[PDB]
Amino acid sequence: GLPTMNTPGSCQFLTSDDFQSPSAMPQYDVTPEMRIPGEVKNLMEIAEVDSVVPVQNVGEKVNSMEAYQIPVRSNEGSGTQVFGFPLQPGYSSVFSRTLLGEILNYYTHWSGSIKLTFMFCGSAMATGKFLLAYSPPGAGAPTKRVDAMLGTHVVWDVGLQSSCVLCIPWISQTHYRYVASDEYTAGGFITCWYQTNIVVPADAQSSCYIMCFVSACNDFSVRLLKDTPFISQENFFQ
Amino acid sequence: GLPTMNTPGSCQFLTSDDFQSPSAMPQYDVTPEMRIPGEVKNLMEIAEVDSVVPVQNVGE
Amino acid sequence: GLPTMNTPGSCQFLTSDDFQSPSAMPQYDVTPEMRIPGEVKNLMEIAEVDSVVPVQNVGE
Amino acid sequence: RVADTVGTGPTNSEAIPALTAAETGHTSQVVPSDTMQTRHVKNYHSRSESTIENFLCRSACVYFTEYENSGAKRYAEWVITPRQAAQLRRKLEFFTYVRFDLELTFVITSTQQPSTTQNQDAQILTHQIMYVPPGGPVPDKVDSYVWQTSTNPSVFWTEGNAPPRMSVPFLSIGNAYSNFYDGWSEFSRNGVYGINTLNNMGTLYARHVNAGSTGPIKSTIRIYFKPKHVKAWIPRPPRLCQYEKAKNVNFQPSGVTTTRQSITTMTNT
Amino acid sequence: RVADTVGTGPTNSEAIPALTAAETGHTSQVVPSDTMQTRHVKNYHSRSESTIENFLCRSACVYFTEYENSGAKRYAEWVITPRQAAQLRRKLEFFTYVRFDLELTFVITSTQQPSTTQNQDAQILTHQIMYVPPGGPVPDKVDSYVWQTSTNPSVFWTEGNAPPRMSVPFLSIGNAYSNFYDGWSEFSRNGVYGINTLNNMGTLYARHVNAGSTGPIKSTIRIYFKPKHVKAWIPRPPRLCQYEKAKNVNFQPSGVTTTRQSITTMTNT
Amino acid sequence: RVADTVGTGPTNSEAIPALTAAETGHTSQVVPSDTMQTRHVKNYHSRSESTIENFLCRSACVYFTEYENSGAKRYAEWVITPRQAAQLRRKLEFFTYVRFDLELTFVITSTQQPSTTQNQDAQILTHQIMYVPPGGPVPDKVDSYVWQTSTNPSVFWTEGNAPPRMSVPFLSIGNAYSNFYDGWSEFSRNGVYGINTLNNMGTLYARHVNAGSTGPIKSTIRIYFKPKHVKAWIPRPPRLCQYEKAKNVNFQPSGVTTTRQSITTMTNT
Amino acid sequence: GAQVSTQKTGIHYTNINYYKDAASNSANRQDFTQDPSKFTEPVKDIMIKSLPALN
Amino acid sequence: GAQVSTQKTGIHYTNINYYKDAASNSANRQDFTQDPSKFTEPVKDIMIKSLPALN
Amino acid sequence: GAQVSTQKTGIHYTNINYYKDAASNSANRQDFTQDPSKFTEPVKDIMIKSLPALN
Amino acid sequence: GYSDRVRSITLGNSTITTQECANVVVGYGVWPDYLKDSEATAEDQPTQPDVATCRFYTLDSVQWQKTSPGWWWKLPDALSNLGLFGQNMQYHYLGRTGYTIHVQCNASKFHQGCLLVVCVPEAEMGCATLNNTPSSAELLGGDTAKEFADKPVASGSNKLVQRVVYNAGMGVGVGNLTIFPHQWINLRTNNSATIVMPYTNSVPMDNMFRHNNVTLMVIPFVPLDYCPGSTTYVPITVTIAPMCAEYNGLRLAGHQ
Amino acid sequence: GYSDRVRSITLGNSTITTQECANVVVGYGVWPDYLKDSEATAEDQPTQPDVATCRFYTLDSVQWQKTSPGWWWKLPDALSNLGLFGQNMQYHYLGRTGYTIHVQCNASKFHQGCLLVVCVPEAEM
Ligand SMILES: CCCCCCCCCCCCCCCC(=O)O
Ligand SMILES: CCCCCCCCCCCCCCCC(=O)O
Ligand SMILES: CCCCCCCCCCCCCCCC(=O)O
Ligand SMILES: *C(=O)CCCCCCCCCCCCC
Ligand SMILES: *C(=O)CCCCCCCCCCCCC
Ligand SMILES: *C(=O)CCCCCCCCCCCCC
C-alpha cells in the first residue's frame, strides 16, 4: 500500500494528451507493412509543392478555370498593372485555398519565404517583359510601376524559359506572423506591371495568359495547431 | 505522499485487460501437475486436423 | 495493478503548489530567445535602486 | 529545423536561378538569396508541430448517440466510420492511404428526464460499451445473452470516474487503410462504388447495465478517435466542397475560392 | 509465425505428394508447392492470437443474480459453475481437461425501485460478497454470524468505485479440471451421472452491508470469469446442439449443418 | 545569501564613502561599515523568496464566467487576457517584457437554481473547456460541430474530481511577451493604441456536455494562471493609480502617497 | 527485480510483480509454441508425403 | 527498462512502458524527418537551379 | 533518469519528469542569481565609493 | 551534341520519339518494378508476359477545342481491351502494373494553350445526384476518353458523375491536382508530357476490373487559341505502356 | 546546358533577366569600385548606403516609332528624384557612382530595327 497523493489534473481528459492506454486486442498480429510510393513525413513536404493560384478571383470566374488565368494583353503603353494581391498566404482569398493556404489554415502562426512561379502561356511568337515586385508594408501599395520600382522586384523577360520565379523574402518585425489577419502582423503587397508592352507578330494572338504557382521555401514553418474554418457541419453525415 | 495524477481509463473494466489482482487464497498449494496426453498449445493445431465435410447439405 | 494508498491532500488545489502538468500544445516550437537589455533576476535588484522619497507628504 | 539564409551580394552572370520551365512538373527551388542580396540569418525555427503525428494525433469526436433508462432506445449501436464527422475526416483525407493505431476515449454523460414520477432517488449508473467484430452475434435487446462478452471486448464504466480509454491496433487486412477507393465490390463492376466497399470495422453497442432510478434518464456516448503511430502515403488536395454523405465522395460543386473585385484589389470582399 | 511458400517449378516423377490413404488416421501434409508451381512468398503472419491463453483469457459473464434492500431477497447465493452461460462454457468445452488460474471481476449495479415512500434520500450502499468453500456454515439470513468471514474470504465494496477483482488458484483436487466425466459418483454405477459428480466449488453469497435508504433498492451482481495461465488437454468437437441443462450434456438433436440446394449450389439458402 | 557586516573601527581620513553626486544616475553603495563602527555579523539571510520565479509563480484567478443548464447562456467564452484582474496584472507590470510558460488550473463549480420544477434528481455534470486559437471556427451554440475539437485542444472534466490542469508554452510571436506597447497597429499611426494591438491569444469556450437534471443549474468557471519558468526584462515603477480598463493604461490621477501632518510628524494620519 | 520483455509488433515493456502468489500474476499471452503432429499424423509408422501411403 | 529522451525546447523525460502491446504505447511526436524531393522535383533528369531548364 | 537536488534549508529531493515537453515541467524556484549593477551603477566611467564623485 | 528537348523511349515493339519536351516525371520518385517475395501474399507463380504486355498502346486521339473542359481515362480500364494486356487481365484474378504515359499534342508557333497532364491515384468520383453513386458506364470509358463538363451536372435521379472541371469530379480544387505526378503541355514550350507511374495501392496486387488504381486527366488550364489561318484541328493522342505487369490467379476468362 | 544568350543581374532588391543578349559591355574595361585613400581629397568619412542606393531603378518607358529620332538621359540627373539615390544626392555636396545600364526592347520575328545604346562621358551639348 504505497502512499500516493493526487495533483490537480486527475481524471481529466485533455484532447491533446499523450498517454498509454491498455490494448483492447492483445497479441493481435498486424498485417505486415508494404512500401507504398510517396510517403509524407511532414506537412511542409506538401506546402513546398507548387499549386496553381486563382489570381482572377473576380466575380464568377471563381466558379471556373478562369480564376486560374492572369490576362496579359498587347497595350498602347507600359507601366500598367497586371495584378495585385497582399502577402497573406492563409487569409487572402487568392492564397487561402491553395495547397499552402489550406495547410496554413490548420495553424495559427507562420514564418518563411514563398515562391511565386509565373508561367507564360502565350504563343511561341509573343514577347514581353514584366516587373514582378513585392513592397513591404508601411506606405500603401505601389500604384505606379515607379513606386513598385523601389521595392523588391525581378524583371521577367519572356523567352524559352517560360516561367520566372519571384521569390518573396521574410521581411518582418517579428519571428512569425498570424495566419489570420492582424495589422500588427501586416505582410506587404505583390504587384505586377508591364515593363515593355507585349509584342506579337502578325497572325499570332495578342492576348495571352499567365499562371501563378505558390510553394513554400526551405525556411517556411507553421506553428500553433487549430481547426480550419473551411469545413462545417450541421448533422452527422449519413 | 507521492504526487500522482490519473489518466483517462481509471476505474474502468476492460473485458480484455491484462492486470495483476490480489489472490483471494494466499499460500495455497496447487495439486501438482500431471502429464496428460494430447495437450493443445495453439488453436491451429486443431484446425490442421482433417474433419469430414458435409458436402451433400441438400435437404434433410 | 500496483497497490497504492492515498494520503490526505489528494485532489486538492494549493495555489502555491509546484507540480508537472501535461502540455496542451505538444512539440510546439517556441520563438527563440533574444537578449533584451536589463534583465531582472531577483526583486532585490530593484530595491537596491534609489527612488525619490516624498518626505513632504503634508497636505495637498 | 528550418534553413538559414546565406549572405548574398550583387551578381552579373548568365546563371539564371529565377528562370525555369514549370512544364517539367518540377517545383522550383529558388530561395531569397537567389533573387536579391540576403543577409546571413540563423534559423532555429522548427517544423516539429507539422509532422504527420502532431497533425493527426489529437482526440476528435467522430460520432455520438443516445440510449435510455426505459422505453425503446435502451441500448445503442454504431457501425464504425470516421466519415460522419467533417473535422477528422477531412484531415485523414489529405492522404490516400493512412496506417495507424487508435486511442479510444469515450465521454458518457447522462441527463435526468422530465417525468411525473415522484420520489426519484437514482442509484449510480454503470455503462457497458461492447464491440462486435464483423460476424459476431448482435444484441437485439438490452438483455440478450450477447452482452456476456465472453470473447468480444467490452468496457464497463461507472459514472463520475475518469473517461474509459483503450487503444486498438491497425485492424486492416490491407497493408494500409484505404481512404479512397475508385472501384466496386463486385467483379462485374457493380454493386457498391467507393470507400464503403472497404469499410467493415464492425459495430459498437452501448447500454446501461442498471436503470438506477424510478425516473427516466437518457445517456449520450461520445466516441473520440486519436490516430497514434501514424504513417500516411500519397497526399492529395484538401476537401473543397462540403461533405454530403458519410459513405461517398458526393459533393455539391462550389467555386475555387471566395471573391474580391479587380485582380488589383488588395482586399477580400 | 506462419510458413513461407517455396518457389516451385514443373515436375514429372513417380513422387506422389497428393495421393495417400486417409484410412491411416493421419492428416495429409500437402502444401500448395506440391500440386502446382508456387512462387516464393515470405510469411510474417503470426498465430499469436490463437494461442489457448488468448482464446480463453477474456472476461466473460458466467452468471448474475439480485438481492434487495428489504423483503425476502435480502442476500443472494450462487453455487459456482461456468456452465450456466452458453458463451464461456462452449470455449472451455473445446477441451476435455483444462487447468488454470482465475481472475474474478464483479460488476455490482443498483436500481431504485418503485415505492409510495416519500422523502427518500439514499446513503451510499456497501456490498459484501462472501465465498463459502464446500463444508463451511451458510448464511441463512442477511445477519447470521456467518457474515463475519473470520476465515472465509470476502470482498467489501462501496458503490461508485472500480469493480472488485481478485484472482484464484487452480482449486482442483485433480491434476486438471475435468470438463466432462463419463461416470457416476457411486461405485454401484448409480446416483449422479456426468460432470456434476465432479462440481464441488462451493457457494458465493452477496448482500447489502447497509440498506442506505427508506425506499427500495435492488442490486444485481454479475460474476465475470477469466482463465489466466491456462493449460488444456485432449481437444474435442465444438458443441453443435444448443445447451439444455447446466449440469449435463443434454441436448436436443440438430442437423449437421444448415442447407443449400444441389451439391452444385455455390450459395447458402 | 545576504552580505555579512565587517567589523569597523574609527577613521580620520580624506576618504569619503558618504559624500557623492547623485546626479550621475548611479545609486550609492555605502554600507553601515562606512559611516559608523560596525561589528562583524555573519549573514545567513537568503534572498530566495524574492527571485522572479517565486514572486510570479503562484496561481492567481485571472477571470471567471458562468454558463447554464438551459436558456441562452448555455456556453461561455472569454478572450484571453491577464489584465482583467488587478492582482496578477500588477505583478507582471513590474516589468516591460516578460517571457514564461503557463500552468492553467480551472475551478469549475455548480449551483442548483430556483425553479418550480418538481422531482429534480440531477445526474453528474461533465464540462468541456475548449481553446479556439486566433483564426479557428467559433461555437455559435452549445451544439455546433465546433465542439468536436478534432484539432483544437480541450479538457473534458466530470464534477467532483480534482481541478483540470495543463501547462502551455510561451505562445508569443515575439522573443518575449510585451506588457506595454507605446504604439499603434496601423502604420498610419492610427487604429488601436497600446497593448491591445498586441493581444491576440484567442478565445476560451466552456459548456456543459450534459444538462444532468430537469431543474436549472448554473456553473462558474474560474481560470487560474501561474507563470512557470519566468524571464523578465526592463523593470518599471509599480502601478500607483487604480486600473480603469482591461485594454489600456487609462488611469485616474492620484496623489504620490497618503498624508501625515508636518514633515516632522512621526505618524501616518 | 523487474523483467523487460518484448511487446507484440509487426520495443520492450518492463514488468514487476507485487503479489506473493503466482496466481496473482498476469496472463501468459506470448507462448506461441505449437505441435500439431500429435493430432495431424499420430501414426506409429512414419508416413512420407512423396511416397505411396499403402505399399 | 526505461528510456530517457529529450524534451521539446527552444532536459530529459524518462519513459517506461507497462503494456505488452506496441499499440498501447504513446504517440511518436518527435520524428522531424522530411523529404519534399518526392513531390518537389519528381523529374527523371536532374534540374539544376542556375541552368536553363529547357536547353 | 532522475535528478537529486537540494531542498531549501536554514537533504535532497529526487525528481524525474514524465512529459515530453519542457513546458510541462515544474517551476525554477532555486535560481538565486542576481546583478543589481545594471540598475545601481549603470554609469560609463567607474565610481569608487571612497573618492569624490565629482573631481 | 545533345539537347534536353530530345527523347526516345523503347518498350517492346514500340519506340517513341520527342523533339520538344520536359523531363520524364517519374511517379513518386519510384520507377516501376515487380513484386517482392517479402511483399507477396498470392502463393501461385505469376505470368509476366513481358514484351507482349509492357509495350506502347496508343488509344484514340481526342480534339482539343477552344471550349474543351478536359478529359479523363481510368487506368486499368482503357487498355482492358487492348492486345495481350487486356487478355491476361481477363484470365487472371490478380494483376499489378506501372505505366509510361505519353500524352502527345503538337501545335505551332502561332498557337497557344496549356494542358495539365496528371495521374490521380484513386480518383474516386462523385455523383450529380447526392444520394447515388455514378454508374460504371458513367465513370469508365475503355480507350475512349471520358470528358469533363463546362458547368454543373444536374442532380436529378441519375448516376451521372459530377463532371464540373473546377472540382475535378472529386470535390477538390482543380488547381491543387499538382500534387499528383504531372506535367504541362504549354504549346509555347512543350510538345508532349511523359509520366512514369509506379504501382500505387494498399494491397500488393488487386483485381483489374473491380478497381482502377490510377486515373489520367488532361485538363486545359489556358485554352487553345490561334489567329485565323492557323490550323484549327489540334488533336491530342494518348499512348500508355504497361510496366512490369504480373498476373496471379489464372482461371476462365471474364469479370462477374 | 548553357547559352551566351541568357543572363541574370542581381543588385540589391532587384534582379534582371534576359533571354536574348550580347555580352555586358564593361565601361572602359573598368568595373566600378570605391575611391582609394591614394586618390582622395575630401577628408570627411563617406556614406556608402549600399543596398539602398546601388539597386535597379527602372525609369519611364518610351515608344519607339517608325519616325523616332532618338532619346537621351543625363546621368546623375535621371535618378536624382528616384529613391534613396536621389536623397543622398541632395544632402551631400560630393558624390561618386558607376552604373549598370540595362536598356530593354523586345519586338518579334516579323519586326525589324536597330538602336545604338551609348554612354557618352561628358556630352556637352
Ligand atoms: C470496446 C472496443 C472498441 C473497439 C473500437 C474499434 C474501432 C475500429 C476503428 C477503425 C478505424 C478507422 C478506419 C476506417 C475504415 C475503412 O474505411 O477502411
Ligand atoms: C470472494 C472469493 C470468491 C472465490 C471465487 C471461487 C470460484 C471458483 C471457480 C471454480 C472454476 C471453474 C470450475 C468448474 C468445476 C468443475 O466442474 O470441476
Ligand atoms: C484548453 C487549452 C487552454 C489554453 C490556454 C491558453 C491561454 C493563453 C495565455 C496567454 C498568456 C498571457 C499573455 C498576454 C498577451 C499579450 O498581451 O501579448
Ligand atoms: C527490482 O524491482 C528493484 C527495482 C525496484 C523499482 C521500484 C519498484 C516500484 C514499486 C514496487 C513496490 C512493489 C509493490 C509491492
Ligand atoms: C527498468 O524499468 C528497471 C527499473 C524499474 C523502475 C521501477 C518501475 C516503476 C513501476 C513499473 C512497473 C511496470 C508496470 C506494469
Ligand atoms: C531513470 O529514471 C531510471 C530509473 C527509473 C525509476 C522508475 C521510474 C518511476 C516511474 C516512471 C515512469 C515515467 C512516467 C512517464
Q: Which chains touch F (3 or more CB pairs under 8 A)?
A: A, C, D, I
Strands of F75-79's sheet in order across: A12-14, F154-158, F126-132, F203-208, F75-79
- Give the residue from J100, J8, J23, J18 showing the smallest Cα distance to J54: J100
Residues paired with residue J119 on neighbouring β-strands, in sequence order: J216
- Give the residue from A230, A191, A185 showing the smallest Cα distance to A81: A191
Per-residue burial over G2-31, b = 16 or more CB atoms within 10 Å of its CB, e = otherwise:
eeeeebbeeeebebeeebebebbbbbbbbb
- Which distant-in-sequence residues (6+ apart) come within 8 Å of F116 by Cβ? none
- Which distant-in-sequence residues (6+ apart) come within 8 Å of A6 by Cβ? B3, B4, B5, B6, C6, C10, C11, F162
DSSP B54: -
For the record, the C-alpha cell of J71 comes out as: 478529359
> Looking at ligand 5, which residue's alpha carbon is closest to its atom 3?
H1
I17 touches chain C (CB under 8 A): yes
CB A213 within 8 A of CB K121: no
| E strand segments, chain J | 7-11, 14-18, 25-26, 57-64, 71-74, 92-104, 111-121, 146-147, 182-186, 192-197, 214-226, 234-250
CB D85 within 8 A of CB F149: no
* CA separation for the pair C1, F132 (Å, rounded): 38
- Coil vs helix vs strand at E162: coil
Q: For residue E40, which residues of chain J lie inside 8 Å, CB to CB?
A: 37, 40
DSSP E229: E
Strand-pair category, J192-197 with J25-26: parallel
Residues paired with residue E235 on neighbouring β-strands, in sequence order: E95
Which residue type, as a one-letter code, is found at position B19? F
* CA separation for the pair F50, C32 (Å, rounded): 27
- Which distant-in-sequence residues (6+ apart) come within 8 Å of D67 by Cβ? D73, D74, D75, D76, D206, D207, D208, D218, D219, D221
**Domains of chain G, each with CATH number or no CATH:** 1-55 (4.10.80.10)
CB C18 to CB I34 under 8 A?
Answer: no
DSSP D163: P
Number of Cβ pairs < 8 A linking chain C and chain F: 112
* CA separation for the pair A197, D159 (Å, rounded): 76
Counting every residue written for chain J, the total comes to 256
Q: Which long-range contacts (CB under 8 A, 24 or more apart) does F248-257 make?
A: F248/F193, F248/F194, F248/F195, F248/F196, F249/F180, F249/F194, F249/F195, F255/C60, F256/C54, F256/C57, F257/C54, F257/C57
Residue K84 sits at the vertex; the CA angle it makes with K83 and K85, to the nearest 5 degrees, is 90
**Domains of chain F, each with CATH number or no CATH:** 1-269 (2.60.120.20)
Which ligand is the nearest neighbour of the Cα of E106? 2
For the record, the C-alpha cell of A155 comes out as: 524583371
d(CA F81, ligand 3 centre) in Å: 7
- Which distant-in-sequence residues (6+ apart) come within 8 Å of E80 by Cβ? E199, E201, E202, E203, E204
For the record, the C-alpha cell of F196 comes out as: 491591445
DSSP for I1-55 reads --EEEEPP---EEEE----SBGGGSPP-TT------TTTS---SS---TTS-S--
**Residue C52: which region, alpha, beta or left (left: phi > 0; alpha: psi -120 to 50)?**
beta
* CA separation for the pair F121, D217 (Å, rounded): 10
* Dihedral sign from CA coordinates of K48, K49, K55, K58: negative
CB F123 within 8 A of CB F212: yes
Three-state DSSP string of chain K: CCCCCCEEEEECCEEEEECCCCCCCCCCCCCCCCCCCCCCCCCCCCCCCHHHCCCCCCCCCCCCCCCCCCCCCCCCCCCCCCHHHHHHHHHCCCCCCCCCCCCCCCCCCCCCCCCCCCCCCCCCC
Q: In a mutational test of the pocket of ligand 2, which residue from E62, E166, E168, E195 has the highest number of ligand atoms less than 8 Å from its CB?
A: E168
* CA separation for the pair A116, D22 (Å, rounded): 11
CB H22 to CB G15 under 8 A?
Answer: no
* CA separation for the pair I12, I30 (Å, rounded): 13
Which residue type, as a one-letter code, is found at position A29? D
DSSP A62: G
Per-residue CA distances from K47 to C36, E249, K13, K41 (Å)? 29, 108, 19, 15
CB C40 within 8 A of CB C46: yes
Strands of D11-13's sheet in order across: A81-86, A189-196, A129-135, A152-157, K14-18, K7-11, D11-13
* CA separation for the pair F129, F106 (Å, rounded): 9
d(CA H28, ligand 5 centre) in Å: 21
Shortest CA gap A77–chain H (Å): 30
Q: For residue J174, which residues of chain A lie inside 8 Å, CB to CB?
A: 65
CB F123 within 8 A of CB D112: yes
**Secondary structure tally for chain A: helices H, strands E:** 3, 15
Q: Which chains touch K (3 or more CB pairs under 8 A)?
A: A, D, H
* CA separation for the pair G36, C50 (Å, rounded): 92
H or E segment and range at residue A230 = none
**Residue F135: which region, alpha, beta or left (left: phi > 0; alpha: psi -120 to 50)?**
left
Residues paired with residue D224 on neighbouring β-strands, in sequence order: D61, D105
CB E177 within 8 A of CB E100: yes
Sketch the domain layout of chain A as residue ranges. 1-238
- Count the Cβ atoms, other than its own, within 10 Å of residue C36: 16
Please give the class, per CATH, of domain J1-256.
mainly beta
* CA separation for the pair G12, F261 (Å, rounded): 78
* CA separation for the pair J119, J73 (Å, rounded): 10
* CA separation for the pair B27, C51 (Å, rounded): 77
* Dihedral sign from CA coordinates of H40, H45, H49, H53: negative
Per-residue CA distances from D58 to A19, D104, F202 (Å)? 12, 11, 19
| E strand segments, chain B | 2-4, 12-14, 39-40
**Secondary structure tally for chain E: helices H, strands E:** 2, 11
- Count the Cβ atoms, other than its own, within 10 Å of residue E42: 14
DSSP for A81-93 reads EEEEEES-TTTST
Nearest to I1 among H4, H9, H30 (CB): H4
Does the CB atom of residue C24 touch ligand 3 within 6 A? yes
* CA separation for the pair A112, A219 (Å, rounded): 5
* Dihedral sign from CA coordinates of H27, H29, H34, H36: positive
CB D19 to CB K24 under 8 A?
Answer: no
For the record, the C-alpha cell of E37 comes out as: 508451381
Architecture of the structural domain at A1-238? Sandwich (2.60)
- Coil vs helix vs strand at D52: helix
Nearest to J44 among E4, E38, E42 (CB): E38
- Give the residue from D94, D104, D83 showing the smallest Cα distance to D56: D94
Which residue type, as a one-letter code, is found at position H15? N
**CA-CA-CA-CA dihedral for D120, D123, D127, D128, to nearest 10:** -110
Which ligand is the nearest neighbour of the Cα of G16? 5
Nearest chain F residue to C34 by CA: give it: F175
For the record, the C-alpha cell of E190 comes out as: 448409480
DSSP E211: -
**Secondary structure tally for chain F: helices H, strands E:** 2, 11
d(CA G18, ligand 4 centre) in Å: 8
Method: X-ray
CB A41 within 8 A of CB H33: yes
* CA separation for the pair J28, E101 (Å, rounded): 54
* Dihedral sign from CA coordinates of D192, D196, D201, D202: negative
Residue tagged 459548456 (cell numbers): F207
Does the CB atom of residue H18 touch ligand 6 within 6 A? no
Per-residue CA distances from I9 to F48, I3, I12, I30 (Å)? 11, 18, 10, 12
Which residue type, as a one-letter code, is found at position A59? G
- Which distant-in-sequence residues (6+ apart) come within 8 Å of K41 by Cβ? none
Which ligand is the nearest neighbour of the Cα of G20? 4
